Amino acid sequence: MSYADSSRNAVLTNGGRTLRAECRNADGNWVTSELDLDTIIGNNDGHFQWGGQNFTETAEDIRFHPKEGAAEQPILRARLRDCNGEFHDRDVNLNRIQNVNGRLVFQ
């Protein structure tokens, strides 16, 4: 499924630039993994782009929701600024992020 399947203590850090979460590895051990969103997440005029990087420079009000309601769906929403210079709150499915033996990687 995703890293969320075996992740906890998932909170955004650095102002929504770092995704910190504790995910179990292939052995079952809980590993604290951190993925710089700003390193693999981009904002395309109000649209999250997996593999963009530097989205935080055009993103504001970044709030991470690892376990959304009873759905426990990891989604990240923030205000995405467009090339014109406006802002529109968007949301992205962090389910793309999986855990490989104790590491967080986007897919």
Query: DSSP alpha helices (H): ranges in the chain?
Result: 37-40
The architecture that CATH gives domain 1-107 is Roll (2.30)
**Geometric angle at alpha carbon 86, from 39 and 12, rounded to 5°:** 35
C-beta contacts of 56-61 below 8 A and 24+ residues apart? 56/14, 56/15, 56/16, 56/17, 58/82, 59/16, 60/87, 61/89
Q: 52 near 43, Cβ under 8 Å?
A: yes
Which residue is listed with tokens 């009873």? 70
Say how many residues make up the chain.
Answer: 107
Way it was determined: NMR
**What is the spatial distance between Cα 67 and Cα 86, in angstroms, rounded to a whole number?**
29
**What is the spatial distance between Cα 51 and Cα 18, in angstroms, rounded to a whole number?**
14
Six-digit token pair at 2?
């995703």
Helices then strands, counting H and E runs in the chain, come out as 1, 10
